[PDB]
Amino acid sequence: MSTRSVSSSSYRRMFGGPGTASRPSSSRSYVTTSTRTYSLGSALRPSTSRSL
Amino acid sequence: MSTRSVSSSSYRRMFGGPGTASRPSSSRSYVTTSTRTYSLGSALRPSTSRSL
């Protein structure tokens, strides 16, 4: 017989389906500004009382 | 007895498929960083009545 040899390409592995590796968890970011506590002159300003 | 059956082994080398040069999946599957900075916008104007 001329041997019908086993043509042995990568039917064994290199597959496949879970090619979904690094899904972007970066879709969860947490951006926030340098959050201000605001200044107020209300404790710099006393009551200048006029005595008559 | 022979035959004319095709005799493909692996026959064109043996090394897998063309086929995965391991393109590096960077860890952008982490969470994008918390940009938690803070502005001390109030104490930087020390608003106190020295009129006492």
Q: Which residues of A touch B24 (CB under 8 A)?
A: none
The resolution, in Å, is 7.2
Cα B35 to the center of its chain, rounded Å: 19
Nearest chain B residue to A46 by CA: give it: B49
* Measured distance CA(B27)–CA(A23) in Å, rounded: 10
The answer to whether the CB of B7 falls within 8 A of the CB of A4 is yes
* Measured distance CA(B47)–CA(A45) in Å, rounded: 8
CB-based contacts of B9, cutoff 8 Å, min separation 6? A5, A6, A7, A8
Q: Which of A2, A4, A43 sits opposite B49 (nearest CB)?
A: A43
Q: Which residues of B touch A26 (CB under 8 A)?
A: 28-32
Nearest chain B residue to A1 by CA: give it: B2
The answer to whether the CB of A36 falls within 8 A of the CB of B41 is yes
Q: Please, which experimental method was used? A: cryo-EM
Instruction: Check CB contact under 8 Å for A2 and B4.
Output: yes
* Measured distance CA(A22)–CA(B26) in Å, rounded: 8
Q: Which residues of B touch A21 (CB under 8 A)?
A: 25
* Measured distance CA(B17)–CA(B15) in Å, rounded: 6
